Amino acid sequence: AKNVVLDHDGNLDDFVAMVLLASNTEKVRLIGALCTDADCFVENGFNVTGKIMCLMHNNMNLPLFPIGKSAATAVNPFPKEWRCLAKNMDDMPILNIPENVELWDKIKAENEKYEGQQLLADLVMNSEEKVTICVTGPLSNVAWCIDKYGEKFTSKVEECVIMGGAVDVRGNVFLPSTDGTAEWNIYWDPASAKTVFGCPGLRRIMFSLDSTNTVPVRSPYVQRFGEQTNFLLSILVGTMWAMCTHCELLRDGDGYYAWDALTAAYVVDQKVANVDPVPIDVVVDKQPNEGATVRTDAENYPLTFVARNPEAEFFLDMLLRSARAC
Amino acid sequence: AKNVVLDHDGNLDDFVAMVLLASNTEKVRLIGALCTDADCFVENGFNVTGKIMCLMHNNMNLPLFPIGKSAATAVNPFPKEWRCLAKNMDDMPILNIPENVELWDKIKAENEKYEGQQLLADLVMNSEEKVTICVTGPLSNVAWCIDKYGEKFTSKVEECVIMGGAVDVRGNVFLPSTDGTAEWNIYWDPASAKTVFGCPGLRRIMFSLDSTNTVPVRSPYVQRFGEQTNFLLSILVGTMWAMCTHCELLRDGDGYYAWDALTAAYVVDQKVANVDPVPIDVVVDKQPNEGATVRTDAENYPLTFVARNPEAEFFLDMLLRSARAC
Numbered sequence A, B: 001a002k003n004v005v006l007d008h009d010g011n012l013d014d015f016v017a018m019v020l021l022a023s024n025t026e027k028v029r030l031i032g033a034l035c036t037d038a039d040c041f042v043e044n045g046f047n048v049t050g051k052i053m054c055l056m057h058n059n060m061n062l063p064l065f066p067i068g069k070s071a072a073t074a075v076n077p078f079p080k081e082w083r084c085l086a087k088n089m090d091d092m093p094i095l096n097i098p099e100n101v102e103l104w105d106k107i108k109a110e111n112e113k114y115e116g117q118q119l120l121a122d123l124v125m126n127s128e129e130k131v132t133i134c135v136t137g138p139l140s141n142v143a144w145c146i147d148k149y150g151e152k153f154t155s156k157v158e159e160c161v162i163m164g165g166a167v168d169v170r171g172n173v174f175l176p177s178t179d180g181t182a183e184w185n186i187y188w189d190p191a192s193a194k195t196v197f198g199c200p201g202l203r204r205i206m207f208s209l210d211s212t213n214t215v216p217v218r219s220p221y222v223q224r225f226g227e228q229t230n231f232l233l234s235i236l237v238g239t240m241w242a243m244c245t246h247c248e249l250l251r252d253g254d255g256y257y258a259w260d261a262l263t264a265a266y267v268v269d270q271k272v273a274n275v276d277p278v279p280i281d282v283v284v285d286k287q288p289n290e291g292a293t294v295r296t297d298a299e300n301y302p303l304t305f306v307a308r309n310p311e312a313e314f315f316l317d318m319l320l321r322s323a324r325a326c
């Protein structure tokens, strides 16, 4: 197995990503997680991370790992309605089984001490083998580590597998002030994304909307978790997906996708997608396309490996199988 | 046990109300249900009703009953975001267990043939013993039965226990062209509500916001369903409540309440609340208070028994216990 740190922001797919990483122990050793106050309220995202970890630890092969709240602050905050989802999950019966929340209350004090950005730096820098960072929220934490530690940090990163951006397709940030070309994780903190995408000697894999658009969360697939209710993880994953199957009803053709789950699936098994090198820059200016990830023809600019044409069925099967881990 | 029909509109508390009624076999014989296209999309609300019924049939010997979709149409439709919740529920693992879905698929076509309004009229009029109607959506269906059948229908109603209105407290319908004095179930179809509240020889119990304000859905209580994951009904009820606990974060002091559940609890046990007779009229004209339930001074105006001083703790315990039936 390879060392992985999950750098997430506590939406539903972030937690599915966590389940994927934590359940595939032969491929992934999940050595830590951090939660950013972006697409969640960080207190809730933190507690849900702990509750999921404890559920899994108490029912399967999963060493406990440190969980930190990131100090990162928004440039452009997420909509409040989207940030609420970790609050809902914090209250879900599946995440509040007595033995699991007992464990979480016992191990919480240690985890409360951490600051997520420093934790990310430490886990990466202090690991014997290189660490893969699975980034499923904004890029603020990776940028903070690059800024503070430079090559001392980046040399220890195997690769950074990032959910974010939109290269050859429209974005998903649709605000009166925006032109729709930006994707939300980048838009939340464009300057940090720019630092990450421009960093030489950091290997980056990018799951932009170009690839994640192929995995909308659809009812028939979600209902398959109902076939697996003997498994706690299937109740968990299926519940989280069931909470997003209406989004396409609200936003025609623009619902919820397994964005972060596909990203984590690639960390588990790179057969999830082939990747193409693209030099990626980020618009940081307060223009309508703030946060857009754009190709740059700048000489000697670092490459980012953009996922294309993912193996959607392989991914969907991986998740259904992984959710039978307990 | 007394005969009860549930006339609901497919939001989360509607389904908690259904569970409360159905699980209390000693007190309630649930002989039918109908779903209205009000605070849900009726196809989803219909399917969730069927899926809950089938779960309960297969796990606690609950007799099957007819389920109809009402043809009622909105005067003032609900916000689309609120109507989505039955979509989410339709996809929940707990409601998609194969044995239960197989049963629902087998029997759903027979239920699809009913007109919901006619089903309400027929179940009431054809019953050997009188029927209590628990109305947790708008009053359109009871009004239709009154308009079509008059005393032939109302004489067969034991009582109508209604979630709706706001008598001595503010409402919950807030837009620049309303004054916030109306409650949503009434506002959805004011004229139907007027027909029901003004109908002589119909016993009405009214759970207005005056009483339901005592039962906000809050995280600590909701998390107690986590103590009960050995019970399918607690996974179900707790999941539905967990989907509500953020609403107060979105609307300060104006979150989600156990509106319909408290109403159904009264059907199970009238000790849930005292009632006081009030003559209730409904504003139907295009006024800022369209949909408001007001005291009327009209001579000989029919009385409605408005719930007061509900036993909130008794209710909370009743629901936690009922959710342990299976």
Ligand SMILES: O=c1[nH]cnc2c(CN3C[C@H](O)[C@H](O)[C@H]3CO)c[nH]c12
Pocket (backbone or CB within 6 Å): A011, A012, A013, A014, A039, A082, A136, A137, A163, A172, A183, A184, A185, A247, A255, A256, A259, A260
């Ligand atoms: O509809 C939405 N509901 C919640 N969050 C979002 C995001 C942001 N996040 C969600 C995923 O966690 C992913 O990391 C990123 C996609 O832009 C984009 N649209 C929605």
Ligand SMILES: O=c1[nH]cnc2c(CN3C[C@H](O)[C@H](O)[C@H]3CO)c[nH]c12
Pocket (backbone or CB within 6 Å): B011, B012, B013, B014, B039, B082, B136, B137, B163, B172, B183, B184, B185, B247, B255, B256, B259, B260
């Ligand atoms: O915040 C809300 N989310 C969903 N629905 C509503 C209603 C309408 N319904 C909800 C209950 O089913 C109840 O019957 C009625 C209360 O006005 C009022 N506020 C909200």
Ligand SMILES: [Ca+2]
Pocket (backbone or CB within 6 Å): A008, A009, A010, A011, A013, A014, A039, A136, A137, A260
């Ligand atoms: Ca995310």
Ligand SMILES: [Ca+2]
Pocket (backbone or CB within 6 Å): B008, B009, B010, B011, B013, B014, B039, B136, B137, B260
């Ligand atoms: Ca209702």
Ligand SMILES: [Mg+2]
Pocket (backbone or CB within 6 Å): A057, A058, A059
């Ligand atoms: Mg165990």
Ligand SMILES: [Mg+2]
Pocket (backbone or CB within 6 Å): B179, B181, B288, B289
């Ligand atoms: Mg007024």
